[PDB]
Design a binder for this molecule. Sequence first.
Ligand SMILES: [Fe+3]
Ligand SMILES: [Fe+3]
Lengths: 569, 565
Amino acid sequence: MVQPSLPQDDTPDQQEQRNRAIAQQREAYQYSETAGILLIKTLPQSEMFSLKYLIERDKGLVSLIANTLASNIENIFDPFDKLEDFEEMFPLLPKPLVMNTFRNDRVFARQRIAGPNPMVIERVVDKLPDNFPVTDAMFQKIMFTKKTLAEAIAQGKLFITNYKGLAELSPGRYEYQKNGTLVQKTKTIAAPLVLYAWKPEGFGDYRGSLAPIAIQINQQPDPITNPIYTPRDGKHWFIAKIFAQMADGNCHEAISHLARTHLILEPFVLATANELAPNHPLSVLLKPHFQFTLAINELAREQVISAGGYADDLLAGTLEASIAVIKAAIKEYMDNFTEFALPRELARRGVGIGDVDQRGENFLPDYPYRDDAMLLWNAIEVYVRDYLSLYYQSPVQIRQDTELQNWVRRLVSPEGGRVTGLVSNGELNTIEALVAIATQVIFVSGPQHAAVNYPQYDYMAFIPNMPLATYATPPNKESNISEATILNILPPQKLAARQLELMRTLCVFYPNRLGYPDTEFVDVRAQQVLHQFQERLQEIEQRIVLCNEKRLEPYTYLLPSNVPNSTSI
Amino acid sequence: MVQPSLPQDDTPDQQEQRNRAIAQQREAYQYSETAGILLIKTLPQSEMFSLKYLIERDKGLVSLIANTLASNIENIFDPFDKLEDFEEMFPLLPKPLVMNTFRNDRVFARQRIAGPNPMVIERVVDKLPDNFPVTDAMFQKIMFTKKTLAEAIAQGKLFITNYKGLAELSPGRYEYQKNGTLVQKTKTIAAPLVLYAWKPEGRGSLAPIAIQINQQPDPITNPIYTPRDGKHWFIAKIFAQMADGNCHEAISHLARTHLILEPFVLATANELAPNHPLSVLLKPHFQFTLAINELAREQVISAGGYADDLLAGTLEASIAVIKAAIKEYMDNFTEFALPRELARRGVGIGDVDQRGENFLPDYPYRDDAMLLWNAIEVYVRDYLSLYYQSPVQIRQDTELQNWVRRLVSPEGGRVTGLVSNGELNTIEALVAIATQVIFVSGPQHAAVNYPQYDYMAFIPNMPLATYATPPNKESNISEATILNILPPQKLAARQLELMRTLCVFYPNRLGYPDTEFVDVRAQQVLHQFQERLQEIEQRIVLCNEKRLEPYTYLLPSNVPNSTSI
Ligand SMILES: [Fe+3]
Ligand SMILES: [Fe+3]
């Protein structure tokens, strides 16, 4: 229980102790890589999960044993017999909230702003992509209007999810034994473009809602082999949405979840261990938000991104392709770190709080993720500022903090995370910059990972709403579509069971709670700051309850009581 | 990396250092109790499972999800439709070794000497129990002989498993919804007596002679069944096995491996400095023990836990049996050393006839366990000799005396049979204590833990509970009668899940600690121990080539360094 202090304010003996501890930690937290991803070489036992954690996780897994025992699904690579079978997969589990309404277009579109991956939709500016040949005829026939695409774009009414990031995926393979021989099959890759429109009148009331307009399943347009489907296409439209959802799933797990929550946090935990003394104010601020992060990332290394792991069996591409996408997302995030602060990232997609019309209202008024996440971001920013100002009163202390300077230097180094977009002028020089960095790290570890992790069961544990891979080509636009066609597009029984398995263990419990660390701060000032953070969190909780009373569907994933303190599951 | 030293040989500064560490450890390893069982209050994070352990355990649980997915067993309290269904529960799991031959009487009897619970059989002396009215007529008709019971007992040919310990169990209950109504049913308990004989003719082997399912005899409602009884004999074995299962899990496994080790780990933390030689000797053999005992508290002996759902009695009754076993073990600690324990059941190495031959020549647990016991004894004698030159160092070791005092205290384990004269005074006494602790943590827990899948994951061979009364001796027995006696589908699935989880992997290996001894001499002691373990492995392989069935559970390769699963 030592009072935290900057290293340039300690006696030479105290400095010797700090360097001793830092050297020991460097011995314990050594840098390693798997397939070019920065991980820890050996997990320190003090960084393992707790007994409490293990008890909860075990409860989840045993619940999966029981639910499997009560289920009728079989251990086969055959498709299901009936679509209804997908709804009989939860005899002893909660029913995923999306199950009943997933066919509705508004429920399909709302997942762009309140589903597991609210990170893709962007407002169209100037024009649609030239490989997305949507015409005025299509837009008018779907919207039942005389307005043109150009006029709608001029009014900020059109939005788009472009999944070109998945275009270069190599399709995943799978094989099994049937009738004594080895059958080998290949998944189907899709990189769709989806045009949505904001409807202020909505679907028959005074609630404005997002409405899907068009879906091109792949990137290169062709009127016969890759047409533009619309809600007027019936079953084909349905199939189109499936593929779109599949795309959204992959981007969700590779980019939004694994890359930009779990894996980008790792170099920060490791840098904290390698450059900051135990009694350094920054380490004491951040370590509560790193609890179990190294451990859960080791579990991801062993069980998710490993050969035969979840990403291998479930995702669209081969394990190699998926890891390529993950690494590209990590690299883009690290190169432009400060640009991925929540306000700037929302603005860059044209759906920030400042993307308003002439009347002063947002082009996308219904965006629960944006609003709640903004509340959490501002609260965390105030908490971080008030905390760090207790130990940094003038920027010269920032510049003369040797441990903090080595922290930044380790982060931006090629072997320490390659975070080249972390600081300006090649150095950390101001207090506000550190405030922004810590705010973003804490926001990612808690709020962001909550928002991308916990909708996974409600939207991705019911397989037809968001299958992680599709298993048949998109039928020709003129072909007849039977139930067996859709059943062959959706995953076979074994892989659907694996997807449910994954989504259940990832959402089964909350390892900790935002703003409630295990050990309180030795500094009574800091503990007061923590308390006011908790009070503001209660205020935010009540405000979000109030918002949920008037929203179309409640958005519960960013309530402070549902947000972990760290990325830990 | 500090050289180990006795606490009275250190400088005053070093002494206050040891007292500091010991005080800190006392706050971290605080004593607690669940239902009168001594456990730890809060598990120190340093005592948690490692990441590797968690990876292996997760592989096991996922294997259970996959095996369940491929199975046709349902989540119902109905019995199975076919007996054959019990053999179809392992589509993606190893088939249990006992599955094919469990109906054979010799396979039934040989589990007393090489099954999961080789701790019950005892040689009959003088006479059978008076509540077990086996006659000369029965014995002669079974053995096809003219010899009497008295002559067989005089020759040491008769052995017995007396499950009187289960007689006072309150039967367990279970309830479930069926057509909008709550059905409530009760398990059937049994406390059988089983008479075996050593048949030298046959390789000689044990042969079951008689089974009385309950303790109080009655020719109508509790007769003495024999192999001549056909179906009824079969049922009489089921109940017997059920008994042997309960005694196995309550007494042999939970009580006398997992739970009796806990006070020793906690005493080591509460009274010994980190650089104390005894702590450095024992802590490798305590790895994950506190953690796995916490998992037992949460998942095994808890309401709705495994013991609640699977065992014969209520959770209260099972915990009563567990606590009685712990108390008898601690009260008579020295008497439960392997040679003495075998001698008290008349099946030790010294229980020989006039020819010098053992009355029970086929006892793989005894032979292999004796090898391991002697090896460990030499190991800890040569280890402790490096630090205890004369017994006055034993008497003047304050941390060790506080260790003993904590162990025998009523709130620290109540190990009243740990020490003579109320004090630890000699070196050899400590050698026997450490020998027994290390033997229990590794060899014993291996021998009772790892046959669990091969004999208890196939439910009909050893059901942890029976779900119908023994049929009348004259009534007809259909497949449905047996299926109603055996556990319903859901509880059979639960039993398989438990055994598989307990036998998936080996968390560590006997004689191979994670961190070496900082003392070079101690590393020589350990190296010698490892060489002896190699020799023992070869000897046991040789013996397994000559035995009827191999006995692999006490091979040094297969024995963990601690009780950790
Ligand atoms: Fe996660
Ligand atoms: Fe065990």
